[PDB]
Amino acid sequence: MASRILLNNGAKMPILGLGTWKSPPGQVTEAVKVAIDVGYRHIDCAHVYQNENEVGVAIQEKLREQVVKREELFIVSKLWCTYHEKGLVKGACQKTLSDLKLDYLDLYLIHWPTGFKPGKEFFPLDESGNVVPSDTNILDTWAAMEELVDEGLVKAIGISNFNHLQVEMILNKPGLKYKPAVNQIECHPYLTQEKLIQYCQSKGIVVTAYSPLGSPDRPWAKPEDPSLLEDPRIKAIAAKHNKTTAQVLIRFPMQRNLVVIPKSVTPERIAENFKVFDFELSSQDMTTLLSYNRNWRVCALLSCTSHKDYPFHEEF
Template sequence: MNSCSGTVTVLGSLCLITLQAPPGEVAEAVKAAITLGYRHFDCAYLYHNESEVGMGINAKIKEGEVRREELFIVSKLWCTYHKKSLVKTACTNTLKALNLDYLDLYLIHWPMGFKPGEKDVPLDCSGRVIPSNTSFLDTWEAMEDLVIEGLVKHIGVSNFNHEQLERLLNKPGLRFRPLTNQIECHPYLNQKSLIEFCHERNVSVTAYRPLGGSRNGVELMDNLVVQKIARKHGKSPAQILIRFQIQRNLIVIPKSVTPSRIRENIQVFDFELTEKDMEELLSLNKNLRLATFPTTEKHKDYPFHIEY
């Protein structure tokens, strides 16, 4: 897989979205992943587990199993911190929680700004998110300042559609281009147009939810095509879905806190899907989006009102 930074080889990625995990489970998952060879870890303020992620990372650094510069640590700016004066506060809070001096990559989690305050998703009486009067173009300027100050190495975005990304890339006075756009991506939502758009502009694509998930009783890993290809290669459906994205030149971030699954998810570099396999997986596209964030649909910057 291509390196995110040009200096770190990303052999696999672990997305630690473990909101309901018992205390200690996330730290142990991180430690197990580092031992297995993972060097890329995807975090976020919203996951509310960055201190545990940091415990796992720092334990392995202290043991001498890995050096900080061998790791690629990613986190994300949450929507209630889009005001320019709050961006640095959010970043330094994340660094403190992770017990790190810098991030390798910091993303704008969503293009939508929310009203600042104690609630992660502030809602009005009708159950709709309360927006802030911010623009992600202004938020980006504060993100660029983080690079200049040495708090982060690179910056990027997440859940941006092609129009929003184009606005950012064409922003007057742009100092740093987004390194990546992190988007939901799996065979039921293959994102072909958005991926082509990003790659044509030298913006990498990071695929979250690569294993899909359940919606309306639809479970991607139960798909007969996925299972047939898995049997053909002697691999699990999850390994097929991860390899599918790797061969599309994407950065893949499956999530798991189970050591056996963490191990399985990285064992995807000893086989290759055929052109026919890839075509069959691409043909499964249903434009089925799992992460829709319905309380934000009326927001001026809601990203999913257009095709891609």
């Protein structure tokens, strides 16, 4: 099991990253520092998570302590939907570089394929609770992302929550300069993404699995929702290998040649989640876990189901 995966730009991406969604500002700085001390070399971020400054502080501290060099870190961020307009993309990236205190990003993703009306609101809603979309399309935005690569501001560009038709639009774009290196998508035993994974890997596109633990801290969780961490079937697989349920959940996407970005702001869990290179799930274990699929999404973007570019109407 290699700890990194070769990307289609030539760079190697560490297959284990720290997620930072819902990491509060007054705790994410310590989280990132503990991550780096423990051995994480991949931090996944986004403007919309409202904590990039605080991630920036932590990276800078560890660079100045000389625990890591910058070229050893792989730092990812995402362009939020309100900045899909072509002329706003660079501004958005620069705002993120400035908060992270970096001169370059290793990877910059289009966060969602849906463009929202520009402004102060992250989710500019209408009367009905539906997002006001921007008069934008995916191809023009991709063109703006490509300029970021040409300027050296980002080493790789990518997409997140794109379906295979949307990825295909980019790949078939007239005058394409850069293929996306990565598709970042929800993926866990309840949403196993077999068809999207097969498509992406066949196109040389690396897949990053998000919400690998089932995002137990998600703000909209309901008591009826299934719970990966509490599944006694997954607990027995963990008990079998003398590991924890979270460790099994993290390791699972790794053996599928995926990148995985579990989130924690608890030092002890940050360390636990890292200890996933010392065991192996069996073939039987993998087939078992794959059979738990139930097309269940944490992030279904339900305010945008009328948006022309809503990703999740299509099968995959």
